Design a protein around this ligand. Structure first.
Ligand SMILES: Cc1cc2nc3c(=O)[nH]c(=O)nc-3n(C[C@H](O)[C@H](O)[C@H](O)COP(=O)(O)OP(=O)(O)OC[C@H]3O[C@@H](n4cnc5c(N)ncnc54)[C@H](O)[C@@H]3O)c2cc1C
Ligand code: SF4
Ligand code: SF4
Ligand code: SF4
Ligand code: SF4
Ligand code: SF4
Ligand code: SF4
Ligand code: SF4
Ligand code: SF4
Lengths: 189, 296, 446, 252, 95
């Protein structure tokens, strides 16, 4: 941690672990507050949120550390953390926090910011593809068409699948947020 | 005689149609009229879609809401995740002015607007409530006693949590869904940490599947130790995770679980004389035959 | 401008009220000490020991209690309530409800006309009563008869009777024959007294922790609160001072302490303030379990250990030295095993940064404190405002912590806000001095 | 006289010891009383907190809590000073209000807001933007060019070492009895306590009295306290002293 | 962390991260006290030691975590930690 050496293995092994005041950008923290709609800066690190988490006992995911990073404005540390997509959004932390914080909403805002930096698991992009094409993240197939026919049901449910005219409208919504273009250009090989 | 638009999201019509059919028919024989929405789409799934962009989540859920709005009816639901999306966005846009304005100016591109005139209910909400069909009316509508079956209830997460955003009471030892199973004549059993997430939420079930299965296997260990003959759900996400996950836990790990898991509406159908055939039990990854032989 | 009656009233016979009454009487003012309960002792009479000196609570309090009873300048009206207050600092016409005691003191028996004294305190009546009710002093954990005393060391030992539970069989009457202390048909009495100043010392109760469902206080049988633990650990409690599990009576080897239970909370269920002494009696309880039960280990799930006062930090050092484990994490939730009713406490140890699941045989919640029931009605009777936290409001937050905006009324003790015993006694003495000023001058101007 | 009341108060512990905080050798390191005088409108300047090194307004102020307290090393004090957490919060609020854009960092180790309306004050201080790093300061260096202060400690929450840059550093030093107080309390036959404060007749049920008759204690000389607690103690001592005077006799 | 699976990659990836009271052996902690000749159990985790360390800024070594492990008696976690030999024994923490 003496200085940069330009030897990547040594730069990784001797990374500076000290928090500096240049490591904080407020802009990150008020984007988080203006997107999550929660009083995130009011956390005083009681640890109830982590003690509630079903993901914490089996991984390195710690929601309290993410709250601390949000308070200290440590972008490039929260966003580029693979344990950001282990939150199931079970809302147990939000249900138990003594400060009326919704840490899972902070997680959602962080995930939004991470998507705006091309950091995103590929399942989300595939779901975007599916919803853009058909309006359904979990679409219908021939075998269930046969099953529904055997149930006395119509082959296609009363959805955008039966009525494709609505699908175009859905597409416009995605097209308004440039979401299709980003999903396409990130799904590239 | 109360009538509701039936939102009918992705998994129930597209992998477990028996849940759809049982919902319509069972709600019909009790005093409720579930009738289709006009071209409803995926409610923007709160995990798999709300993680990458919240504004598209708002816009799509609002479009789903305003379909029923122009339909002049309020929505009934059978999915906890669909409940999260639809009900939460409806609650948010009725109070936040600037978010509603942004949603409306996005929706203006398809000539269709949000104003917030309807309400959203889970079909379990209606099945309990007293003005709508109560628990006694369901108990009366039961033809086959369906007794002699240890049933474990899984509440899920998006229906009741958080307390500060919901209205269902205590999210830490609820008993109401237990009363719903009890009305059918099946005895509900208690198992440790019964309020635990199934692990499929937030897109985790897609992102790192082994982590999600470990959360499901903990739940399944507890449920078997209780001695359950079946698991009951109010969420097709939880349905999918428990059934297919049992298939993938048998594969990935070496844990054998043959516990059938059913949405509550298949149990209502079985209690009300519906056959396994028109409930499409064969589309479940885990065979329901032991449970049916126990109850019939 | 206006004369002042040479009398004072102290409402609440707790340590604050007892100290205020003793101070006023020693100054020479005739004082009324009004107590809701049949005995004066208060909350300090329920404690086993006291942090940080580990002295026995009853032993220090017994001399002070004996003095109030003997003192000639104090009339100690126990088992009475304030019905109405009218007037101002000059003359306060206060009408009091003497609830139906059911048993006569020797003075009252003499006044009635019978030479037989009333209730020497023999206790023969309680030996024959067939009704068994919970005891509020032990607060639901020990049995008591319809005619009873709170405990052995009660200042007025007159054996009150609960007429709402008494079946009027008349067996205690024969048990007390030739003294005629028991009159089963007596009712409330309305008395009017004129006092110059009044001191409010209503005290506190426990916050209802049936809420906060994540800690199964009324759900799981081996989850108790702080005062239940004090009564269980005292040698005069429901058992012989042997801490036992309520579920099966076995001796616990392992107990957790959940600090800040319902405290510093902004969720609207608990309290947003600090109760100022939860940490210290939690440390005291850890010391007591470690000393009494050999090999038992205390776990304190804490958040900002607060040992701020004189000899408080050294008490913390001693407790850590004796082997108490300190996990810095607010308890997330509590489960129990169905077979053995052990309690799984789930939280994070934020230091060491890891999730934690701790087995305990017993779980003790350091609940927040609240104003007593009926304290708001009395506070309105005297025209006193409340604080933002719900406690009685003082005249000035800095330079007048005892006086109120209304003249002639002064506060003392936890009724003004949570405090330790020494702070409570200091406040009581200050309030007594402030009340004595107008009486000693004998005149105030308004 | 008939009775006596001792109210000798307190002074600041000499934080010139405990060398790792450069109180005397670094110019922009001050104690809490100096901070109060510097930020008061009646102080040496017009209430404008300025750096002693060059007179320029600071934008970054650190507060070292527990400075010389809860210390068992024999240099500081083993007890808590009771009010240093609260006036540190007050100082953080004052700097964040008077100087726009200034950030307060409080290096704390057990925030102690126990009194009435104290937790709400702590909530308000955090809400206004004060940063709380849960770690006792390890040491303090200073840059030779700009007399700014490098504060080295660990954020034990977040579990990482930290080096915070501050223009001003304020030490919340411990409190001790005033000089000459021990001689006075010996002159009245009052014994000291094992912390060095004046001893009480009974630690529980007589906070004002003393073993020697007719002598009563009031204020921080009995032990560190807030102003309201000090006033309550003083009024109690006044009442206890007035009782024998009012009666006119002491019964043997 | 549900249970043992006997798949080593999954056992490493799903290791139980929860501290249990069965994870503590006192024997380790009084061997530490009877060998180091110091009052190790009296740590209250102020973090001054880690803030003093010259090894902490450039590695994962945290002396405060080792003190916590000693207090909680977490052998097999402190001993089998490669950041146990990064201490230069500069005695700044002790100082
Ligand atoms: C679990 C626990 C442990 C504690 N341990 C310690 C310890 O070790 N050391 C220590 O110093 N402090 C300890 N405390 C704090 C201590 O209990 C208080 O500081 C003290 O009880 C305050 O005295 P008080 O007279 O103001 O309160 P109280 O004793 O509650 O005084 C109120 C009295 O007035 C009566 N009263 C109330 N309302 C009315 C009314 N309307 N009309 C008539 N009478 C009324 C009540 O019946 C009662 O007798 C502990 C507190 C708790 C909860
Ligand atoms: S529960 Fe709330 S206050 Fe506690 S650490 Fe989590 S977010 Fe912070
Ligand atoms: S919402 Fe996410 S962070 Fe909160 S408890 Fe559930 S999984 Fe953990
Ligand atoms: S039996 Fe009579 S004398 Fe004895 S305690 Fe009861 S009332 Fe008093
Ligand atoms: S009359 Fe009442 S108090 Fe007396 S013995 Fe009968 S029940 Fe008990
Ligand atoms: S006194 Fe201690 S336990 Fe009680 S509220 Fe304050 S910090 Fe929490
Ligand atoms: S009052 Fe706060 S800063 Fe002062 S010694 Fe006590 S804990 Fe430390
Ligand atoms: S060992 Fe380290 S963390 Fe523990 S008290 Fe000493 S300096 Fe603080
Ligand atoms: S001796 Fe030096 S290197 Fe070792 S832990 Fe202490 S400060 Fe760090």
């Amino acid at each position: 941690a003496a200085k940069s050496y330009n030897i990547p293995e040594l730069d990784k092994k001797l990374a500076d672990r000290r928090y500096h005041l240049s490591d904080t950008n407020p802009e990150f923290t008020q984007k988080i507050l203006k997107t999550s709609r929660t009083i995130a800066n009011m956390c005083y690190q009681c640890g109830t949120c982590t003690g509630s988490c079903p993901s914490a006992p089996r991984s390195s995911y710690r929601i309290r550390l993410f709250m601390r990073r949000c308070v200290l404005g440590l972008e490039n540390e929260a966003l580029t953390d693979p344990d950001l997509w282990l939150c199931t959004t079970c809302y147990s932390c939000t249900d138990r926090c003594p400060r009326d914080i919704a840490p899972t909403d902070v997680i959602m805002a962080m995930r939004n910011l991470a998507f705006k930096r091309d950091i995103v698991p590929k399942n989300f992009l595939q779901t975007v593809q599916l919803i853009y094409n058909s309006g359904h993240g979990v679409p219908n197939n021939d075998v269930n068409r046969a099953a529904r026919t055997k149930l006395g049901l119509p082959a296609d449910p009363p959805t955008t699948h039966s009525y494709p005219e609505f699908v175009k409208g859905i597409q416009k919504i995605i097209d308004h947020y440039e979401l299709k273009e980003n999903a396409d250009r990130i799904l590239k090989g | 005689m109360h009538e509701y638009a039936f939102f009918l999201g992705c998994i129930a019509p597209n992998r477990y149609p028996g849940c759809e059919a049982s919902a319509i028919k069972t709600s019909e024989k009790v005093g409720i009229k579930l009738l289709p929405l006009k071209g409803a789409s995926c409610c923007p799934a709160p995990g798999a879609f709300g993680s990458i962009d919240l504004n598209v989540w708002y816009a799509m859920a609002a479009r789903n809401l305003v379909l029923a709005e122009e339909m002049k009816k309020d929505i009934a639901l059978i999915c906890n995740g669909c409940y999260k999306s639809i009900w939460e966005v409806n609650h948010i846009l009725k109070h936040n002015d600037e978010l509603r304005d942004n949603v409306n100016e996005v929706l203006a591109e398809i000539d269709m607007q949000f104003k917030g005139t309807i309400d959203v209910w889970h079909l379990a909400e209606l099945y309990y409530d007293d003005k709508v069909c109560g628990v006694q009316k369901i108990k009366d509508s039961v033809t086959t006693p369906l007794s002699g079956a240890k049933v474990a209830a899984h509440y899920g997460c998006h229906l009741m949590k958080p307390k500060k955003e919901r209205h269902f009471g205590d999210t830490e030892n609820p008993m109401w869904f237990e009363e719903l199973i009890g009305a059918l004549g099946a005895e509900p059993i208690q198992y440790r940490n019964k309020m635990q997430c199934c692990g499929a939420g937030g897109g985790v079930r897609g992102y790192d599947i082994v982590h999600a299965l470990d959360i499901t296997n903990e739940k399944l260990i507890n449920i078997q130790e209780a001695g359950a003959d079946a698991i009951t759900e109010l969420c097709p996400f939880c349905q999918l995770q428990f059934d297919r996950g049992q298939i993938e836990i048998k594969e990935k790990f070496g844990d054998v679980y043959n516990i059938p898991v059913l949405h509550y509406n298949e149990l209502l159908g079985l209690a009300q004389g519906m056959s396994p055939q028109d409930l499409a039990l064969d589309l479940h990854a885990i065979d329901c035959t032991p449970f049916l032989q126990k109850v019939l | 401008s206006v004369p002042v009656e040479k009398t004072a009233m102290v409402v609440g016979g707790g340590v604050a009220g007892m100290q205020a009454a003793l101070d006023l009487a020693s100054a020479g003012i005739k004082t009324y000490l009004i107590e809701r309960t049949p005995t004066i002792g208060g909350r300090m009479s329920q404690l086993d020991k006291t942090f940080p000196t580990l002295d026995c609570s009853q032993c220090i309090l017994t001399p002070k209690m004996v003095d109030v009873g003997r003192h000639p300048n104090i009339e100690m009206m126990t088992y009475t309530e304030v019905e109405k207050v009218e007037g101002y600092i000059g003359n306060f016409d206060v009408t009091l409800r003497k609830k139906a005691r059911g048993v006569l003191t020797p003075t009252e028996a003499t006044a009635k006309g019978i030479v037989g004294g009333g209730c020497n305190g023999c206790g023969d009546c309680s030996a024959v009563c067939p009704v068994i009710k919970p005891n509020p002093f032990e607060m639901g954990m020990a049995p008591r008869k319809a005619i009873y005393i709170y405990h052995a060391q009660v200042m007025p030992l007159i054996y009150t009777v609960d007429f709402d539970s008494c079946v009027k069989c008349g067996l205690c009457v024969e048990a007390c024959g030739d003294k005629k202390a028991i009159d089963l048909e007596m009712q409330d009495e309305f008395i009017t007294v004129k006092v110059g100043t009044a001191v409010l010392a209503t005290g506190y109760e426990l916050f209802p922790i049936e809420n906060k469902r994540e800690w199964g206080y009324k759900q799981f049988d081996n989850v108790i609160n702080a005062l239940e633990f004090e009564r269980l650990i005292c040698a005069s409690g429901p058992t012989g001072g042997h801490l036992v599990r309520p579920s099966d009576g076995k001796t616990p080897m392992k107990v957790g302490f959940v600090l800040c239970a319902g405290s510093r909370d902004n969720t609207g269920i608990g309290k947003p303030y600090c109760s100022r002494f939860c940490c210290m009696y939690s440390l005291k309880h850890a010391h007591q379990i470690m000393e009494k039960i050999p090999g038992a280990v205390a776990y304190l799930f804490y958040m900002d250990i607060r040992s701020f006062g004189k000899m408080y930090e050294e008490f913390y050092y001693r407790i850590q030295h004796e082997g108490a484990k300190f996990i810095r994490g607010r308890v997330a939730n509590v489960l129990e095993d169905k077979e053995t009713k052990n309690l799984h406490v789930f939280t994070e140890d934020t230091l060491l940064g890891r999730p934690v699941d701790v087995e305990v045989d017993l779980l003790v919640l350091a609940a927040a404190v609240q104003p007593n029931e009926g304290a708001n009605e009395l506070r309105k009777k005297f025209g006193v405002s409340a604080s933002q936290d719900g406690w009685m409001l003082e005249a000035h937050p800095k330079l007048n912590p005892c006086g109120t905006t209304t003249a002639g009324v002064f506060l003392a003790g936890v009724c003004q806000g949570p405090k330790d015993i020494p702070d409570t006694v200091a406040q009581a003495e200050g309030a007594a001095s402030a009340a004595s000023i107008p009486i000693h001058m004998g005149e105030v101007e308004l």
